[PDB]
Amino acid sequence: EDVRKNRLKPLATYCSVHNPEISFKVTNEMQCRENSIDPTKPLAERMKIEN
Amino acid sequence: GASAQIVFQEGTVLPSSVRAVNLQRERLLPERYPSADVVSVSFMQLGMASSAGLFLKELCSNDEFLQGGICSNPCLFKGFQQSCSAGEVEVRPDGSASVN
Amino acid sequence: CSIIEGTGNFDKCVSQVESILVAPKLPLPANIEAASSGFESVDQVFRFASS
């Protein structure tokens, strides 16, 4: 259940508001959200699979 | 006419997705001439022909400027009228716009 | 659409040129060739590479 030991961590850290790698291209911001990894939602909610 | 270009401080931290164009490495200038790292960008959508077409397509599609046929254009002068198409416009001495 | 009517407003024309041509929210591909830098639109050029 640990955050660091989670398999989604390399993608979840790559997709966040803090991360400036996405900010270069506006099209890239929509690309990650469509693959269920939302940068708007916090890390605890982003990693968690709803229902 | 078709495309618009913007080509132009020192040792700035540039993103990985965008590359600084070096005229010496790209075989555009020799080694004897001083090094020139420039920001080279070209957009077809901003070129005279494409810009006029893309504007009318986006402006008239929006509900704000279109009201069941009439497309309000703020760029065009008061009283000026033309057919709703991206065709070439020629001004006739009659006081009307000839759209191809 | 059938008829285009001129309203004559520069400030409204500027905002439309900005939202459509200069700084579009959903811009065109703008590919990265041997001669091109890689920027998608004008707004991103002076934001990260101003001189």
Side-chain angles (χ1 to χ4, degrees):
Chain A
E1 284 176 71
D2 198 273
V3 287
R4 287 179 182 95
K5 286 269 180 285
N6 203 289
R7 291 167 289 177
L8 277 143
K9 199 211 171 185
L11 295 154
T13 319
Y14 185 83
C15 294
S16 187
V17 287
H18 295 252
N19 192 270
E21 188 87 55
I22 330 146
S23 70
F24 312 144
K25 302 262 183 283
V26 287
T27 51
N28 289 17
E29 284 174 54
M30 201 199 83
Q31 284 184 284
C32 192
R33 187 188 56 86
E34 237 76 11
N35 294 291
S36 301
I37 310 129
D38 215 315
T40 69
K41 284 172 83 72
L43 193 82
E45 288 169 73
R46 169 162 60 242
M47 291 258 227
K48 195 184 179 180
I49 307 148
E50 284 291 294
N51 304 285
Chain B
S3 303
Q5 294 96 62
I6 310 131
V7 185
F8 59 97
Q9 184 196 278
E10 282 171 74
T12 49
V13 180
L14 280 156
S16 185
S17 55
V18 291
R19 53 168 286 270
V21 192
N22 183 261
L23 292 144
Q24 276 71 22
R25 280 190 283 266
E26 295 297 310
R27 288 280 290 185
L28 289 141
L29 278 160
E31 289 298 313
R32 65 178 191 267
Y33 278 85
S35 186
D37 298 65
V38 293
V39 183
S40 181
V41 288
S42 183
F43 315 98
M44 191 183 78
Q45 57 267 60
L46 290 150
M48 285 298 135
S50 302
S51 62
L54 193 83
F55 192 83
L56 287 159
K57 189 74 188 181
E58 288 276 80
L59 187 99
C60 307
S61 58
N62 187 26
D63 60 284
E64 200 188 296
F65 295 94
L66 192 84
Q67 192 56 257
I70 41 141
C71 179
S72 298
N73 206 313
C75 307
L76 292 164
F77 303 100
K78 294 171 186 178
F80 185 80
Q81 210 179 282
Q82 64 163 89
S83 187
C84 211
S85 53
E88 268 168 60
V89 181
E90 197 196 78
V91 181
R92 282 195 286 178
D94 181 80
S96 58
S98 182
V99 198
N100 216 315
Chain C
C1 189
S2 300
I3 285 104
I4 309 157
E5 205 272 311
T7 49
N9 198 338
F10 190 69
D11 296 294
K12 276 191 178 180
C13 177
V14 165
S15 61
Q16 285 303 291
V17 162
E18 188 73 89
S19 63
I20 300 152
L21 313 147
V22 186
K25 297 272 177 179
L26 285 101
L28 282 154
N31 302 130
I32 316 135
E33 58 184 70
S36 195
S37 292
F39 293 95
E40 274 194 32
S41 290
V42 172
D43 63 335
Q44 308 284 351
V45 183
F46 307 107
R47 207 168 287 176
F48 305 138
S50 60
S51 181

PDB file of all heavy atoms in Angstrom, chain A residues 23-27 30, chain C residues 25 27 38 40 44 48:
ATOM      1  N   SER A  23       4.388  21.069 -19.309  1.00  0.00           N
ATOM      2  CA  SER A  23       4.148  22.498 -19.568  1.00  0.00           C
ATOM      3  C   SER A  23       4.704  23.069 -20.886  1.00  0.00           C
ATOM      4  O   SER A  23       4.222  24.113 -21.334  1.00  0.00           O
ATOM      5  CB  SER A  23       4.596  23.346 -18.380  1.00  0.00           C
ATOM      6  OG  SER A  23       6.007  23.363 -18.243  1.00  0.00           O
ATOM      7  N   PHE A  24       5.698  22.392 -21.504  1.00  0.00           N
ATOM      8  CA  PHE A  24       6.311  22.813 -22.769  1.00  0.00           C
ATOM      9  C   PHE A  24       5.311  22.752 -23.933  1.00  0.00           C
ATOM     10  O   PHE A  24       5.284  23.666 -24.758  1.00  0.00           O
ATOM     11  CB  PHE A  24       7.568  21.977 -23.105  1.00  0.00           C
ATOM     12  CG  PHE A  24       8.609  21.760 -22.025  1.00  0.00           C
ATOM     13  CD1 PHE A  24       9.296  20.555 -21.932  1.00  0.00           C
ATOM     14  CD2 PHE A  24       8.961  22.786 -21.153  1.00  0.00           C
ATOM     15  CE1 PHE A  24      10.277  20.360 -20.954  1.00  0.00           C
ATOM     16  CE2 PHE A  24       9.940  22.590 -20.172  1.00  0.00           C
ATOM     17  CZ  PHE A  24      10.589  21.377 -20.078  1.00  0.00           C
ATOM     18  N   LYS A  25       4.493  21.679 -23.988  1.00  0.00           N
ATOM     19  CA  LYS A  25       3.483  21.459 -25.031  1.00  0.00           C
ATOM     20  C   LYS A  25       2.088  21.344 -24.410  1.00  0.00           C
ATOM     21  O   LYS A  25       1.874  20.498 -23.539  1.00  0.00           O
ATOM     22  CB  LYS A  25       3.808  20.193 -25.854  1.00  0.00           C
ATOM     23  CG  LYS A  25       5.173  20.198 -26.541  1.00  0.00           C
ATOM     24  CD  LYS A  25       5.087  20.621 -28.003  1.00  0.00           C
ATOM     25  CE  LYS A  25       6.423  20.554 -28.701  1.00  0.00           C
ATOM     26  NZ  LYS A  25       7.301  21.701 -28.341  1.00  0.00           N
ATOM     27  N   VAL A  26       1.139  22.192 -24.857  1.00  0.00           N
ATOM     28  CA  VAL A  26      -0.247  22.198 -24.361  1.00  0.00           C
ATOM     29  C   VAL A  26      -1.038  20.933 -24.732  1.00  0.00           C
ATOM     30  O   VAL A  26      -1.946  20.544 -23.993  1.00  0.00           O
ATOM     31  CB  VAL A  26      -1.032  23.507 -24.654  1.00  0.00           C
ATOM     32  CG1 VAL A  26      -0.551  24.650 -23.766  1.00  0.00           C
ATOM     33  CG2 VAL A  26      -0.969  23.892 -26.130  1.00  0.00           C
ATOM     34  N   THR A  27      -0.675  20.290 -25.861  1.00  0.00           N
ATOM     35  CA  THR A  27      -1.293  19.050 -26.351  1.00  0.00           C
ATOM     36  C   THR A  27      -0.955  17.862 -25.443  1.00  0.00           C
ATOM     37  O   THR A  27      -1.770  16.950 -25.304  1.00  0.00           O
ATOM     38  CB  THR A  27      -0.899  18.772 -27.811  1.00  0.00           C
ATOM     39  OG1 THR A  27       0.521  18.858 -27.950  1.00  0.00           O
ATOM     40  CG2 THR A  27      -1.582  19.714 -28.796  1.00  0.00           C
ATOM     41  N   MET A  30      -3.334  17.051 -22.178  1.00  0.00           N
ATOM     42  CA  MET A  30      -4.543  16.267 -22.431  1.00  0.00           C
ATOM     43  C   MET A  30      -4.204  14.783 -22.647  1.00  0.00           C
ATOM     44  O   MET A  30      -5.016  13.919 -22.307  1.00  0.00           O
ATOM     45  CB  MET A  30      -5.278  16.829 -23.661  1.00  0.00           C
ATOM     46  CG  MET A  30      -6.745  16.455 -23.726  1.00  0.00           C
ATOM     47  SD  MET A  30      -7.438  16.646 -25.388  1.00  0.00           S
ATOM     48  CE  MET A  30      -6.938  15.101 -26.124  1.00  0.00           C
TER      49      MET A  30
ATOM     50  N   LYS C  25      -5.572  27.474 -28.098  1.00  0.00           N
ATOM     51  CA  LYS C  25      -5.568  26.514 -26.987  1.00  0.00           C
ATOM     52  C   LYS C  25      -5.312  25.088 -27.475  1.00  0.00           C
ATOM     53  O   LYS C  25      -4.619  24.323 -26.804  1.00  0.00           O
ATOM     54  CB  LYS C  25      -6.857  26.620 -26.157  1.00  0.00           C
ATOM     55  CG  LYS C  25      -7.024  27.978 -25.470  1.00  0.00           C
ATOM     56  CD  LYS C  25      -6.361  28.039 -24.093  1.00  0.00           C
ATOM     57  CE  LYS C  25      -6.487  29.409 -23.474  1.00  0.00           C
ATOM     58  NZ  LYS C  25      -5.862  29.464 -22.126  1.00  0.00           N
ATOM     59  N   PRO C  27      -3.559  23.886 -30.645  1.00  0.00           N
ATOM     60  CA  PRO C  27      -2.832  24.247 -31.872  1.00  0.00           C
ATOM     61  C   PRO C  27      -2.608  23.089 -32.836  1.00  0.00           C
ATOM     62  O   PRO C  27      -2.804  21.927 -32.474  1.00  0.00           O
ATOM     63  CB  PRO C  27      -1.502  24.816 -31.351  1.00  0.00           C
ATOM     64  CG  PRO C  27      -1.479  24.555 -29.869  1.00  0.00           C
ATOM     65  CD  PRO C  27      -2.624  23.663 -29.527  1.00  0.00           C
ATOM     66  N   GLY C  38      10.841  23.486 -32.854  1.00  0.00           N
ATOM     67  CA  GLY C  38       9.894  22.566 -32.236  1.00  0.00           C
ATOM     68  C   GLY C  38       8.671  23.169 -31.578  1.00  0.00           C
ATOM     69  O   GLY C  38       7.772  22.424 -31.179  1.00  0.00           O
ATOM     70  N   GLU C  40       5.102  24.831 -30.891  1.00  0.00           N
ATOM     71  CA  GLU C  40       3.779  24.656 -31.488  1.00  0.00           C
ATOM     72  C   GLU C  40       3.103  25.970 -31.890  1.00  0.00           C
ATOM     73  O   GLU C  40       2.409  26.000 -32.906  1.00  0.00           O
ATOM     74  CB  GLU C  40       2.867  23.811 -30.585  1.00  0.00           C
ATOM     75  CG  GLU C  40       3.019  22.314 -30.808  1.00  0.00           C
ATOM     76  CD  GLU C  40       1.946  21.426 -30.204  1.00  0.00           C
ATOM     77  OE1 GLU C  40       0.775  21.864 -30.119  1.00  0.00           O
ATOM     78  OE2 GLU C  40       2.268  20.266 -29.860  1.00  0.00           O
ATOM     79  N   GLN C  44       4.351  30.361 -26.942  1.00  0.00           N
ATOM     80  CA  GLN C  44       5.341  29.499 -26.291  1.00  0.00           C
ATOM     81  C   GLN C  44       6.784  29.875 -26.670  1.00  0.00           C
ATOM     82  O   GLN C  44       7.706  29.538 -25.927  1.00  0.00           O
ATOM     83  CB  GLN C  44       5.068  28.011 -26.603  1.00  0.00           C
ATOM     84  CG  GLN C  44       3.630  27.534 -26.325  1.00  0.00           C
ATOM     85  CD  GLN C  44       3.277  27.299 -24.867  1.00  0.00           C
ATOM     86  OE1 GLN C  44       4.124  27.308 -23.962  1.00  0.00           O
ATOM     87  NE2 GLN C  44       2.001  27.048 -24.613  1.00  0.00           N
ATOM     88  N   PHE C  48       9.510  30.789 -23.344  1.00  0.00           N
ATOM     89  CA  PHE C  48      10.680  29.995 -22.958  1.00  0.00           C
ATOM     90  C   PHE C  48      11.989  30.341 -23.682  1.00  0.00           C
ATOM     91  O   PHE C  48      13.058  29.991 -23.178  1.00  0.00           O
ATOM     92  CB  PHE C  48      10.390  28.483 -23.097  1.00  0.00           C
ATOM     93  CG  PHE C  48       9.187  27.928 -22.363  1.00  0.00           C
ATOM     94  CD1 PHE C  48       8.351  26.999 -22.970  1.00  0.00           C
ATOM     95  CD2 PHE C  48       8.914  28.302 -21.050  1.00  0.00           C
ATOM     96  CE1 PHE C  48       7.253  26.468 -22.286  1.00  0.00           C
ATOM     97  CE2 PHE C  48       7.809  27.778 -20.370  1.00  0.00           C
ATOM     98  CZ  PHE C  48       6.988  26.863 -20.992  1.00  0.00           C
TER      99      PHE C  48
END
